Amino acid sequence: RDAQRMNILAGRIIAETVRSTLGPKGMDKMLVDDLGDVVVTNDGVTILREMSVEHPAAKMLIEVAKTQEKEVGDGTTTAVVVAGELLRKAEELLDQNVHPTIVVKGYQAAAQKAQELLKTIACEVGAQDKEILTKIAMTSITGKGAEKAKEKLAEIIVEAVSAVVDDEGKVDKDLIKIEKKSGASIDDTELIKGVLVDKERVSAQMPKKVTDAKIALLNCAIEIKETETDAEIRITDPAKLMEFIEQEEKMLKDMVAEIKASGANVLFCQKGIDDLAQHYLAKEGIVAARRVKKSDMEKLAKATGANVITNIKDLSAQDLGDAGLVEERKISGDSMIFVEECKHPKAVTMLIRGTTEHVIEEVARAVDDAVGVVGCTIEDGRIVSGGGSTEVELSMKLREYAEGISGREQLAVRAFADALEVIPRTLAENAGLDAIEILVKVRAAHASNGNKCAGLNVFTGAVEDMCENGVVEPLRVKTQAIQSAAESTEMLLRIDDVIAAEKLR
């Protein structure tokens, strides 16, 4: 009968299950399917993407959430809690014989008005100041869940994103690889100004270090080759078999001679080196490996600027690569190859260590997105405080503006401003502190001429300066999240009737 009353309540259930997960110490409840595989994750996107639903309108709020995850990578949880309030406060207006067309007009006007206020609240910083840059690095790692180790880790991130800043000022996620490998401890982490591969030489008689490496890039797998024309090999005489095994090997020695004659001190072949072939490339002083993945051969082409060749019978001086140094070392365990190019590098790598395959993958998954949030921050250059601090300031700005606008729509603008007051409330209850008594003091600081950068610290549990502690986030996560909220909630408020949708392609 009510119909619309059933959708406003469904949005609160989906939002309640991802309400307490906000903040660093965000707990999560178990919800295992009928199978048995237990999954424990703090991120909300991992649950909303796999958790089932019951009503058809529940997908409206999840659809807009997927597009938000593919743009910033963090803050999607804050975009869902703001929808439950705006969707709940509407019930107070409907009881007063208010038409849905009136409450939807206040959110659009209030949302657009905030676009100009955030510009004045945001500060201004440079795009190369390493001092303030390090402060943003520790703020990202701490926001995920790795406070025990964040001193040197913050310095490895600022040097990686800053060492790949093009002239136009655009960060590229493809130029940042992540190599996982257990070790002694996580503190044994260091960046490389080049590339990295987890392979070892085939023989122990090859060189260990060489300068001005002339790598020979190959794009062919391991398999018996055949001319473009149909042809097959035949064998019948067992005694004569010894003549072919040595003949084919002879066709390889003279073939590599043309590669070495064209200046090829090194060689990164992509085939199974014959047992006797290892003796030739070893005495001549040419490293090599057997069986390498294609993912490692595609990055070297664009990194070193080599040309992709498919015919081994055509490798002249103009068909080879180039690298800086190729020294063989170890890092508490095996001995892999370390290819570098300090003359003209184009990408960096990271060899995060640890003690178990589970602890290295967790931090390895929360670092790929951290650089993305700090990367776009340098592109824009404007930063604004966050963590519930600015949310309390916007309320005072909207209340003063609500008094100017007249008409019956002056009630929705007040609920929209007060709806954002739940951000510091969830953080207060998270640490086990009362909220009704703490929200009265945070407003006193922002009386008039008070510092706009001030919020509640989850550690000490009192009002402090966010600029000194470490609670700052870019304005892109707020301007886009608040914009998607008004665009998502309007789908359920405008609709005032259901339909028996059946057979619709």
Q: Are 416 and 489 in contact (CB under 8 A)?
A: no
Catalytic residue chosen out of the listed positions 21, 74, 77, 304: 77
Q: Are 192 and 303 in contact (CB under 8 A)?
A: no
d(CA 260, CA 288): 13
Q: Give the N- to C-terminal CA distance of the chain in Å, as an integer.
A: 28
Alpha carbon 241 to its chain centroid, in Å, reads: 56
d(CA 200, CA 210): 16
Q: Are 214 and 322 in contact (CB under 8 A)?
A: yes
How many beta carbons lie within 10 A of that of residue 263, not counting itself? 11
Active site residue 77: yes
Catalytic residue chosen out of the listed positions 21, 43, 349, 489: 43
d(CA 371, CA 373): 5
DSSP letter for 285, please: T
Catalytic residue chosen out of the listed positions 188, 368, 369, 465: 369
Q: Are 103 and 93 in contact (CB under 8 A)?
A: yes
Q: Give the burial class of 414: count Cβ atoms within 10 A of its Cβ; 0-12 exposed, 13-18 middle, 19 or more buried.
A: middle
Active site residue 76: yes
Give phi and psi for 254, each to the nearest 5.
-65, -25
DSSP letter for 473, please: E
Question: Of 185, 188, 199, which Cα lies nearest the Cα of 335?
Answer: 199
Active site residue 369: yes
How many beta carbons lie within 10 A of that of residue 383, not counting itself? 19
Question: Which contiguous run of DSSP H or E holds residue 327?
Answer: strand 323-328
What residues act catalytically? 43, 76-77, 369
